[PDB]
Design a protein around this ligand. Structure first.
Ligand SMILES: *SCCNC(=O)C(C)(C)Oc1cc(Cl)cc(Cl)c1
Ligand SMILES: *SCCNC(=O)C(C)(C)Oc1cc(Cl)cc(Cl)c1
Ligand SMILES: [Mg+2]
Ligand SMILES: [Mg+2]
Ligand SMILES: [Mg+2]
Ligand SMILES: [Mg+2]
Ligand SMILES: [Mg+2]
Ligand SMILES: [Mg+2]
Lengths: 236, 5, 236, 5
């Protein structure tokens, strides 16, 4: 690894600098280097890892969607044959996105998840595993597509099971997991009723628990609750 | 994009 | 070159796709591949080349400024010693920016400028040469700093001389050159009076020539004239 | 940034 010679603390410091500079590819490479030191991650470090890769893959997904839309319009009837270039370039972006997903899933499997014993770490990593299989599913078309979808479902489900037993309904990790699993149901599993039911039940159970929270915790929980409501409004 | 975090 | 096996037309097509997808690093690599085919560039292709690299280096410059600001605040009195990490990471971004500038200047020198015989191409490339030496000057501190500044000045000056002889005062290339050379004077050469004089004279001479233009040409010329006025307002 | 093109 190109980060193997840098101190763990220096990698974390530089990931924070990269975030301030909006250099998310650098941020992700620094956090990959920190994970590969082999020590468990703190809550803040997990946040840095997730934010870095979410921004990298988010840009790739946005580009993939632009190119896929152009590719589909070029394949309708009446469109002029533009040659292989749109498909080739969509494939190039797709392969780069798959590579990033494989990298994150590799960090989770070697060995973040197996060493995560507390609910807050284990749920966070299993949510990430579901997210990155979900991103693979968005672009999947081959023999393993159903297994990719089910790998996302399985990871999200294990995270949900732990979160329901070990975390309050307002815990932002539990809320963010439910938000994303609900989107998985809607966009990946073709299960809009499950997506809506999960978002509504999550929202209502969190609402009933807000009275236990400090002002700071209330702000974090209500932020994600608003995203749940935003999706419910989009879907109903 | 629906919202995800 | 990694683009050596791709058709020139496919490189141009993919540069346009990359622009639509906001993938400017890809766009620049595609346009670099197209330049290296050895044929001269059309007006649209010059635009694709310039927009691609302007966006790449613009992001690098923005990141460099964030990191340089943090580095300076860490070097004031009373600040806590944070170690070498801020300098190291600023240097990393700086070296990547210098590499991009060297790449563009290398394309201009081998062999875009020497084959550019029409005013619209030659002025455009000499403006680019001034721009990329200007970006090198923004980060320069060594023995060659004055020569980097003068390389920008020399390129801009040759472009100005050709533009004044061969182009109308409303030509958008002539206007964009004057805009950027004026910024060079203000920000690089510590010559604010020259920057202001150049922007004002450029604006006034273009104003007096707008009556010759079609509606389409008027829109392009007045767009850059507004940038000249914006800078004049910032500086006076 | 002053404006450049
Ligand atoms: S981990 C980033 C800090 N937390 C948040 O920004 C938020 C309150 C939105 O919660 C949250 C963020 C992320 Cl990236 C993931 C989850 Cl599960 C929750
Ligand atoms: S080359 C891009 C097309 N032209 C323009 O957008 C504009 C009218 C702003 O003119 C212009 C752009 C660029 Cl990138 C460079 C110059 Cl010199 C002029
Ligand atoms: Mg160590
Ligand atoms: Mg593929
Ligand atoms: Mg249920
Ligand atoms: Mg050929
Ligand atoms: Mg240096
Ligand atoms: Mg003069």
């Amino acid at each position: 690894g190109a980060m193997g010679s840098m101190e763990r603390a220096s990698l974390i410091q530089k990931a924070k600098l990269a975030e301030q500079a909006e250099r998310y590819e650098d941020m992700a490479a620094f956090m990959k280097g920190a994970v590969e030191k082999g020590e468990e991650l703190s809550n803040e470090e997990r946040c840095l890892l997730s934010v870095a890769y979410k921004n990298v893959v988010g840009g790739q997904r946005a580009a993939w969607r632009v190119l896929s839309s152009i590719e589909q319009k070029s394949n309708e009837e009446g469109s002029e044959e533009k040659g292989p270039e749109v498909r080739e370039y969509r494939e190039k972006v797709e392969t780069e996105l798959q590579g990033v997903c494989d990298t994150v899933l590799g960090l989770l499997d070697s060995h973040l998840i197996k060493e995560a014993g507390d609910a807050e770490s284990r749920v966070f990593y299993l949510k990430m595993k579901g997210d990155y299989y979900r991103y693979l599913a968005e672009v999947a078309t081959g023999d393993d597509k159903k297994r990719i979808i089910d790998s996302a479902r399985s990871a999200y489900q294990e995270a949900m099971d732990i979160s329901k037993k070990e975390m309050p309904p307002t815990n932002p990790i539990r809320l963010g997991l439910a938000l994303n699993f609900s989107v998985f149901h809607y966009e990946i599993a073709n299960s809009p009723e499950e997506a809506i039911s999960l978002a509504k039940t999550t929202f209502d159970e969190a609402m009933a628990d807000l009275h236990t929270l400090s002002e700071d915790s209330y702000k974090d929980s209500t932020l994600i609750m608003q995203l749940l409501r935003d999706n419910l409004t989009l879907w109903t | 994009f629906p919202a995800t975090v």
